[PDB]
Design a binder for this molecule. Sequence first.
Ligand code: NA
Ligand code: NA
Ligand code: NA
Ligand code: NA
Ligand code: NA
Ligand code: NA
Lengths: 172, 172, 172, 172, 172, 172
Amino acid sequence: PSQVRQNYHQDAEAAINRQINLELYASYVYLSMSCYFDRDDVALKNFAKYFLHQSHEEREHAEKLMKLQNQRGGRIFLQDIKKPDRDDWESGLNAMECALHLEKSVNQSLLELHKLATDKNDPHLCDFIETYYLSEQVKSIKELGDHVTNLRKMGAPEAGMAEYLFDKHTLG
Amino acid sequence: PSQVRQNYHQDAEAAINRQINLELYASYVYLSMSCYFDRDDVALKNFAKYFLHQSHEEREHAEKLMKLQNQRGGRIFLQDIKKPDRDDWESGLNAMECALHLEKSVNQSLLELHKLATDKNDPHLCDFIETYYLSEQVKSIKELGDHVTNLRKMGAPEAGMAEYLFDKHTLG
Amino acid sequence: PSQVRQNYHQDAEAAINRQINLELYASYVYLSMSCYFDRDDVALKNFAKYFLHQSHEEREHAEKLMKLQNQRGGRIFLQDIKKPDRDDWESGLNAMECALHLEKSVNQSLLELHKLATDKNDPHLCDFIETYYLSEQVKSIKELGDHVTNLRKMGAPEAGMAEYLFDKHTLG
Amino acid sequence: PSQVRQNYHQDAEAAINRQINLELYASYVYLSMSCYFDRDDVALKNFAKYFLHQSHEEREHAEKLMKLQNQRGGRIFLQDIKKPDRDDWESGLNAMECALHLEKSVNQSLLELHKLATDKNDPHLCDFIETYYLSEQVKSIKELGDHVTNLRKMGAPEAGMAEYLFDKHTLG
Amino acid sequence: PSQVRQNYHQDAEAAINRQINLELYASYVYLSMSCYFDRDDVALKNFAKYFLHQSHEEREHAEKLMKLQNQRGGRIFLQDIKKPDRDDWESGLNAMECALHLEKSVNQSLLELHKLATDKNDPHLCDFIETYYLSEQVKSIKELGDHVTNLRKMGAPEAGMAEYLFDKHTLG
Amino acid sequence: PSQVRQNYHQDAEAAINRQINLELYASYVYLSMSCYFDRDDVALKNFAKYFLHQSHEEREHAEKLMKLQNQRGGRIFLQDIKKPDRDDWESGLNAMECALHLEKSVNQSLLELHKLATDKNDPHLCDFIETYYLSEQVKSIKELGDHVTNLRKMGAPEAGMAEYLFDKHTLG
Ligand code: NA
Ligand code: NA
Ligand code: NA
Ligand code: NA
Ligand code: NA
Ligand code: NA
């Protein structure tokens, strides 16, 4: 084992590698969404900026897990980053709804990771997940839920001004 | 076609999508290298920082191509980002040599993209590639070649102090 | 020939003179649009400001071509600047759509100029066009396409608040 | 009629449209002169700058008339901007003499516009012309007359140093 | 081949070496001219300063080509820098005329280099030449043409005050 | 003779012209060395910078002699600047050793020039040489000797880290 490794179960190391991939995947999904909103036929710059920021955030999340993996003496094993499920994200509302789904999926994975950490009596990993991931996820989910709610209430996407004005006032 | 599209051949659009993937792939390779140097049994923080910066740069390169694709009215089609060929990059020198190979490969792809742009009489794309990609690549290749040279001359990796001191003095 | 003239084909000189006229024409079209939005019965001040700025930009484009013509030892031959096709531009959306058409037309002329420059092996002129004109055009076309998209989505011009709010939020 | 229109005779509206065209024409003439002085075989940069500034000033004059037309509820009708009478302006002195002629012509048109405004009992228009146009014209005419005088006295254009030194000392 | 070399034809490498020599030669010619104007029997300090600056600029041009050669993995091969054709440059006008000839000659060489780069499908080199050399040359040629024009118009060199005053007002 | 010439022997004027050429030659040699260290397979940036600075210094030395020649009413006669003896300078140590040889050669020439000045009872020239050249040379020779010593002691060039570390610590 790594000279630093202590109380770091192989199952945790594997789960962290999986989580890294998921974070990178989420980054890629958000990048896809950002690019969609930059299309000339979509042209919602603040949706684009929002999702680009999310993409960058997810990359940071992945990098922080990579740092954790090395800190604990695990070994990072990267996997392909799968392309997002869609190229065309349909609408600001649909993208926000998909983002919410993605964030909940990531959260579910983090909760499973936390359960694993607890099961393996790895409090450092538990704490790491709780501290840096779970609160962030809850905040993200709430924010996306709020965005979805607002867009839906505003009549998006059928109401043409809804996404535009949400783009300006909420995302701008 | 997109309302903005003008003089943008489908072959160029496809080539740009391929280049986006290659840039994202290069980003991922450099991320892999960065993580390797952050291993406790490698522990070259400035190599890690160097490659992380390269990873971020490659992502920026990809994002700029995505912006180009949308600016020209092409449509971004993302593909899986393949995992890097290696998890273990062996040494600072070997990583720099692999980086040089990667950069030359990316450069070759950009040169092919430029040839395509010239062939399709797409001077905007030609100019974009020349302006933002080809000079950057040449600079990157030269810098990596310089690093490789220096590491080799210093006796890396067999000479234990070579990578350490290169990490401090060239990359620090 | 002019003492400075070198590698500057008469066909290029002529094409540049034509481009100057086209830029001045575009300036005039945008001035027409600006004035339209300043009508009391239209009263979209930020559309007016947008198009006035475009008018000024096009004049700058023309002046830069005039500077090029003299720099290369060609001789500027001015022609009448034709009045714009319309006095009444109908709506913010219609003006933006017409602007997009105009910009694409100007771009097409620049692409033809670039082809001529390449054909005459005039790399200075090629570079000048690429550097100062083609990227600007692509950006302009994309921006107008984005504006058109947004106005259309917002329901312009039938939806009374669309142009108003676009005027405030996008153009203000 | 326009909801704002009050005491604005159709003849005034027409005269203003004519004046707009004349100002734009004057702008174009001065642009032509500026370009001439930027020729490598003329190369009087401060003459070029002087006339370019005049061109910009005339454009501003036209824009201010357009603003007036809209303020009064008239409708701007643009016409072709005729090319200047000359491509080659011969000399700094000849250009200044032609500028003086042009300015006097513009002044004459403004005086006719003022007479029309007085005839139609349009004191706002009278005041506008007096305030923003007639004093400017007199100043411009005097300045050009002064320049012509000085250039003539200096021996322009036959005395080779005259235009050069006038360019440096009066226009620089 | 050099580890960095990619898409860099030997003919380009040779042409770059030739261009380096030509730039160094031009530097030397301008140094010769500068020294001439510093003679007590010529004593035009701003002509001297002008040409000295040009000499330094040409050296920078040569150094930038040397940097390019190394960046692309070519090898610099220096040749003798031939002495200038003249020790005595006769007059400010004659020097400016000779400078114009030299600049056009350098430009012609750069155009040939660009043609070679295009022929060898070396867009990096093409871009480098266009970006850093061809626009600079056109500007230089125009500036020298302007100087020649002005000196000729002022009556140089027979008119004793022409060079003196040009030295003060244009070059000072 | 020149109106300023006083106590300036033709032999001194000739010797100064020879010295100018030698300084320009030394400049060129150092430029050659600088370029060598910028090769990707050498890649010692601070050696490159060191020699480039020396090249610039030698050019300044030449220019100062040119100024002297004109100040004394001699006439500068330039000669070809011969290419350096080598394209490949082998190593940092070998370049420093060659630089030392070159500097000693230049010093020897300056000493001969001083002897000539003393022989011709030209104290201004003697003083000029002593003041601006001889102390500089001694300093340069000592500095290069120190560099050679250090590189030799460090085990250059066989000891791979020697040039690297000297580049960083002494030249950086
Ligand atoms: Na995340
Ligand atoms: Na890249
Ligand atoms: Na334009
Ligand atoms: Na006017
Ligand atoms: Na040059
Ligand atoms: Na020296």
